[PDB]
């Protein structure tokens, strides 16, 4: 409790098929489940994909503002 503001990871869903142009970024496909750890920038994110830590675009993903997974 009263831990902080940015703690546990955020489960985001790929908005559109994206391919990490560089090693830093990550390549995913619309629908693919992506985990978020921290917002690298206003147009980027910092999480992991298929076991790969890198950057994630905010234009090809939907940052869910819900605590925990949403069954269904």
Curated annotation (Swiss-Prot):
Subcellular location field: Cell membrane; Cell projection, Dendritic spine; Postsynaptic density; Postsynaptic cell membrane
SH3 domain: residues covered: 8-66
Domain of life: Eukaryota
Effect of residue 44 to A: Abolished interaction with ROBO1
Misc note: There are 3 duplications of SRGAP2 in the human genome as a result of segmental gene duplications. SRGAP2C is the only one to be fixed at a diploid state in the human genome. Moreover, SRGAP2C is functional, interacts with and inhibits SRGAP2 and is human-specific. The appearance of SRGAP2C in the human genome is estimated to 2,4 million years ago, which corresponds to the beginning of neocortex expansion in human evolution and it may have played an important role in this process through its interaction with SRGAP2 function.
Domain notes: The F-BAR domain mediates oligomerization, binds membranes, and induces plasma membrane protrusions.
Subunit composition and interactions: Homodimer. Heterodimer; forms a heterodimer with SRGAP2C, altering SRGAP2 function. Forms a heterooligomer with SRGAP1 and SRGAP3 through its F-BAR domain. Interacts (via SH3 domain) with GPHN. Interacts (via SH3 domain) with FMNL1 (activated by RAC1); regulates the actin filament severing activity of FMNL1 and actin dynamics. Interacts (via SH3 domain) with FMNL3. Interacts with RAC1; specifically stimulates RAC1 GTPase activity. Interacts (via F-BAR domain) with HOMER1. Interacts with ROBO1 and ROBO2. Interacts with FASLG. Interacts with PRMT5.
Job description of the protein: Postsynaptic RAC1 GTPase activating protein (GAP) that plays a key role in neuronal morphogenesis and migration mainly during development of the cerebral cortex. Regulates excitatory and inhibitory synapse maturation and density in cortical pyramidal neurons.
Disorder this protein is connected to according to its UniProt record: A chromosomal aberration disrupting SRGAP2 has been found in a patient with early infantile epileptic encephalopathy. Balanced translocation t(1;9)(q32;q13).
Protein name per its UniProtKB record: SLIT-ROBO Rho GTPase-activating protein 2
Lineage, opening ranks: Eukaryota, Metazoa, Chordata, Craniata, Vertebrata
């Amino acid at each position: 409790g009263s831990s902080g503001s940015s703690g546990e990871p955020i489960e985001a869903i790929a908005k559109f098929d994206y391919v990490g142009r560089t090693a830093r970024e990550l390549s995913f496909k619309k629908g693919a489940s992506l985990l978020l750890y921290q917002r690298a920038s206003d147009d980027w994110w910092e999480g992991r994909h298929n076991g790969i830590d890198g950057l994630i675009p905010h234009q090809y993903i939907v940052v869910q503002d819900t605590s925990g997974p949403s069954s269904g």
